[model samples]
Target: AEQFAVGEIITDMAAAAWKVGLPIGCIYLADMNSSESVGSDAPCVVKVEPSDNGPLFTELKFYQRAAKPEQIQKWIRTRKLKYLGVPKYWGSGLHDKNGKSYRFMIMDRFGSDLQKIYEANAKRFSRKTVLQLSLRILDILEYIHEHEYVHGDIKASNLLLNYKNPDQVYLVDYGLAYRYCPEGVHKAYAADPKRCHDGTIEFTSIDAHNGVAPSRRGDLEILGYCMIQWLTGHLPWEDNLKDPKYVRDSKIRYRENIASLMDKCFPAANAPGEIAKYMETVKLLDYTEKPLYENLRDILLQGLKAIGSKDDGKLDL
Candidate 1:
C-alpha cells in the first residue's frame, strides 16, 4: 500500500505549525494504501472508533465516544463561528507490521502549528488579537455547551491559529472535552480531574485542581485563568512555583464553595457591575451576540478579584 495515493492531501503539508511554530502535518487520507503507509510519528491526531457506527454516525459515534474532531466541527456549525478547525481524518484501522489494529481517528496537519506561529510573532500581535482569540474560544463554547458539551480544556496551548491566515485561529486539541463533566449535587462545578484532566494544571479552574468534576461554567472559568496568564503573564499562583501543592490546595479550598468563594475573596467592597456580571457569566460563559475581542478579554480576566481579597480581577490594570 502506498502512503498517499498521490494527491490525497488537500492542505499544504509543509506550512507553519504548532503553538510556538512547527508543522502540524500535511493532508487528510482515508484509503487503505495511505493508511498503511502512515509513520509512527505521523503529524495527525487519531481516535479509536466503534466499527459499527449507526445513522447520524458523525454526531452519534463522535459525541458518544467523545471524538474530538466531531466536537470541534459540530461546535463550529451550531455556533456559526466563521473560523475553521476543519478536522482531517487520516487513514485509521491500518494494521501495523505486527497486525495490531491501530486506533481509528481524525487528524489535521494544518498549515503551521498554531503555537509555532504565536512564538514567532507574539510581540507583533496587538491586545486586540489576543482578545480576539479569546472571544472565538467563547463563541466555540456557546455552541459546545448548547448541545450539552463541555470543554474541560481551554489553554493557550490548545488554542490554535490558521496557518494561512494569522487572524483566524485553527483551534486544536480536545482530549478533555465532553458532553457533561459537572460536579456535586447542585448544578455547580465538581472540578474533578479524572476524565477531565487537561494537560496544564496552572491554567485549570480553581476547582479542577481539586477533585471536582468539570462543568460548562467551570471550563469557562478555567479559560479565564488562561487568558489572564496570556495577558498579564501571571498564573493564579504565579509566585508559588516552589509550593505548587499549597497553591493547588488553596485553589481547591477556595473553589469548594463556588458562590461564597467569589464573595469573600475580592478586593473592593464595591466592584464594577461588569466585574460582577463577568464573574457570573464566566461560570456559564456565553458570547452569543458579543463581539469576539470583548468576549475573549473579559472571559480571560473575568472575576478574579471577585475571588481574591486584593487581586480583584480588574481590567483597568
Candidate 2:
C-alpha cells in the first residue's frame, strides 16, 4: 500500500486521464473509504461535460487524498485490466476533514440509471441488444479474471452505458474487486455479508447466499444471472427489505426466477441441438494446435472489439 504515495499516484493518474480522454482527477478528500461506507455508495457523482481537457461521463467516485497512491498502483499491475479503455481511477492527493488523510479515484458519471433506460424505451432496446450489453461486460470480466482478479461487484448498475453511445457499456468500480485464487478457500464478501458486501443483492449469485467467495466459475454464473435479471426487467428480489440477510434469503427462495433466466441464456438460442452443438465445439480444448487453433479465438476477439468501439457519446439511446 505504501507504494502508492502522492508522487507516483500523480503520474499514473495523469497517464490514465490522457488515455481514456477524461480530466485529470483532482483529489478532494482523505479517508480509508470502504464500499460498505455511506458516502462511498453511489452518492458522490458528477456530470461529465466535454472540454478541451477530456471526454465526459456522468459518474465519478470520490475520495479524500487519504489512501496511499501505491494501493491503486498495486491493483493496476495486479489486475491486468484495461484502465485506459474503461473509466480510469486516477489516484488521490487531497487531504481529509479530520486531517487524518485520504485518497479518491475518478469514475465517469453515466446515466441516472440503467434499469430506467429500458423501462422508458422498451422498443428501442431489444433482447438481443441487452444481451450485447451482457457480452461487453463478460468480455471485461474474462479479462479481469483471466489475470486473477475477481470483480466482486457485478450488477446492472455497475455496468455503465456510455453516454455517447447507448450500446457501449463499461463495467466500473473495483472497490470490491479482489485477486481471486480458486486454489484456496474462497467466498464472496467473507468479512460481513450483512454490511461489508460489495455487490448488489439482485446481481449476486446463489453461492454468495452460502457466503462463498467469488471464484472464476462463480463470476460466470453471476454473469449469467445478471443477464437474466436485465432481460426480465424485474429485480430478482424487487419486493423486499434492504437488510442483507432478508435480501440474501429472498433471492435464494426464488427458484422460478433462476429457471426463467437460464432459459434465456446467450448465443441467441438456436434449435434443439444448437446449444448442445456449440458446447461440443467448445467443451474441451488443447489450444496448442489444430481443431480450434486461431479461427475460434479470432471470431470471439473480433466480436468483442466491435462492441468496445461503440458508445456514440452523443445520444443516450
Candidate 3:
C-alpha cells in the first residue's frame, strides 16, 4: 500500500491520450520518491485489462495458487530485471478508496496479442513473420531458462506486441510461471494424472500431458506448437479442442509422424520445417536438463536461411 501513496499524477485525461507521454495521465507512480518527477516513466501504450471486479483496478491474484505470497514479488522482479523481451514492472497496491480493498498491479500496457493478430490475418502469419516471431521469442525463452525459470504458460495470447516499437515483442502474464530448475539442478519429471493437461489444450507439452513439472524443454515444446500454428494456421489438436484427451493423444500421435505432418501443414515454410526436429530434440531432454537453447535457435535460424530470410529483428511480412 505504501507504493501507491507516493507518486504525483502527471495529468488527468478523460480519453486515452497516455500513449505518447511519460508520467502520463493519472498514473499513480511509485518511483517518484527515488527519481525526479520530470520524465521517469517508460512511455508506451496503455489499454489496461480490467476484470469484472472494477475498471482501473483488478483483484490481486496473489492467492490464486496454493503457493507462497512472495512468489508474486519473485516473478514480478524477474520481469523487471531489465530482461530484453519481458515487460517492465510498474507498481502494485490496494484500491483503498472502494472500502472493499481490491488489489492490483499496474505495469507497462501493450498492444494486441499474437492470437488477435493471427486471427485478424486469416489465422496465418507469413513464413518470414513466423520465423521472426520464433527467433524473438526464442531469445526471450532462452533468457528465462538461463535464469532457471519456465514460463509454464506459453501461448499466443500471452505474447504481447509493443505499440511504440512494433518490432519489439514481449512475453506477458507470468501467472503460471514456475521455477522448476535451479542453477545447477534439474527437477525430476513425475507422472501425476491430477497435474495432467494443466495448461492450454493445444500447445501444452507432453510433459504437461503426463502431469510432470514444466521444464526448459517444455517451454520450447510449447513454442514449437506456436510456431506451427503461425505457419499453418492450425494444429492437429484443433480437431480435438473440446476433448483434452484427444488433443493430448493427437499431439503424441502427430509427433510420431511429424515429418508427414510437417509436409502436409507447412508446405513452403523452410524454417518451420525444422520444428518437428526441434520437437524431437525437446523430447530427448531429461526431466531437469538444460535445453540446448542455441541448438534450438539454430533449427529456426536454419529454417529462416532456407526461406532466404535472416534474423534481423524485423519481419519480412
Candidate 4:
C-alpha cells in the first residue's frame, strides 16, 4: 500500500500535531494530540490523499469556509437546534514523505454509514425513522446553503452516524460541494450537455440532470429523492441507470406529475402524504430561489405526528 503505514507519525505543516494510525478508505484513526498508537477508540480520523488531488482540495476549502467548530456551535445556539449534522472541521495540513506530498484533514470519527444499515434492513426505513433522519438533514442543508455552498452529492453513503452515539448522524464527503452563491450573487442557470447527470444517478437533482450547477433547491430535491428511496426502497428511474438520458427524462416527467410518481412507486398502498407534499414544495422552487427549509421540515414533522410519533431524534436503525 502506498498510503500511510501503520504507526507512522504524520506531522501537520504547523508541526503542532501528529497522527499515527491505520487506514480505512484513505482515512486513518488518530488521537487528537498524543502521538501514542491510535486504536479503534480514537476520537478522530485523518483523511489523506496526494497533495494535488483536486476534490480533496475542494473539500478542504468547504470545511475551512463553513465547518469550523465555533461556526457550527454558534449556529446551533442561535437556531436552537438539538444538533446539526454537518461534521466539524478540526485541522488540515500538508505532509511530505519519500519525496512526495500528501494533503490531510482531521475530523470527528464517525461510525457506519446509513447505506449499509439501510441495506441490512432490507433497504427500507420506517416512516418515523425516515422522518427523523430527514429533519436533521434539512437542518444541515439549511446551514450549508446559508453558507453559500450546496452539497451536490447527498445520499445514504454520505451520511455517517456518530462513533459513540448512533443517534447523531453527520453528513460527510464534500468533494462535490458547489458554491452556488459567491459574494452574495447567485450563479446563473444554464444547461450544458457536457456535464449532464453529474451526481449520484438516482438521487441527483433535476438541475444536475440538466447540467446546471446545483443550488439550494437542488439540495432539497436531492433530499426529497433520498427520503423516497429510504422509505420505498426504490426510485422509478433506478432500473435504467445505464442510460443517463432516460434517467433524466424520467425525473423530468416525474417532477411534472409527482402524483404519477407516487402511483408508480407505490402501486398497491397509499403513498406517504408527507412525501408528496415535500416533493410539491421542492418542485415550486426556482433555479436560484431560496427554499423555506422550516416549511419543508414541518411537512416531515406532520408525517411523524400522523404516525403518532414526535421528533424524538431516534433513527430507529
Which prediction has the highest TM-score against the true structure?
4
What is the lDDT for 129 in model 4?
86
TM-score for predicted model 2 compared with the true structure: 0.51
Q: Give per-model TM-scores.
A: 0.56, 0.51, 0.71, 0.95
CA lDDT, every model vs. true structure: 0.45, 0.43, 0.62, 0.86
Model 2 C-alpha lDDT per residue in residues 1-317, reported as the tens digit of each score: 22123222122234432111212133222222343322322322322222221112112221222122454445547755333124434342232333343333443445444656656776244444543454455556655554445565676556666554455666765545554543443334454442345366656655555666555545554665554455455454556746667767755554434333234443354322322222233323221111331333344344334445432222225
- Pitting candidate 1 against candidate 3, the one with the higher lDDT is 3
Q: Residue 72 error for model 4, in Å?
A: 0.6
Off by over 4 Å in 4: 13-15, 191-197
lDDT of 3 by residue, 105-193 (tens): 44555666888878888988887787778777877787667655677678888887776777778887665566565555766767533
Best by lDDT: 4
Q: Candidate 3: global Cα-lDDT?
A: 0.62
Off by over 4 Å in 2: 1-85, 94-98, 107-113, 122-125, 182-195, 235-237, 240-316
Clashing pairs in 3: 271-303
* Residue 275 shift from truth in candidate 3, angstroms: 2.2
Error of 4 at 145 (Å): 0.4
Q: Estimate, for each residue in 60-114, the C-alpha lDDT of model 4 and write its tens digit.
A: 9999999999999999999998899998877888877788888999888889999
Q: What is the C-alpha RMSD of each candidate to the true structure, in Å?
A: 10.2, 12.0, 8.1, 1.9
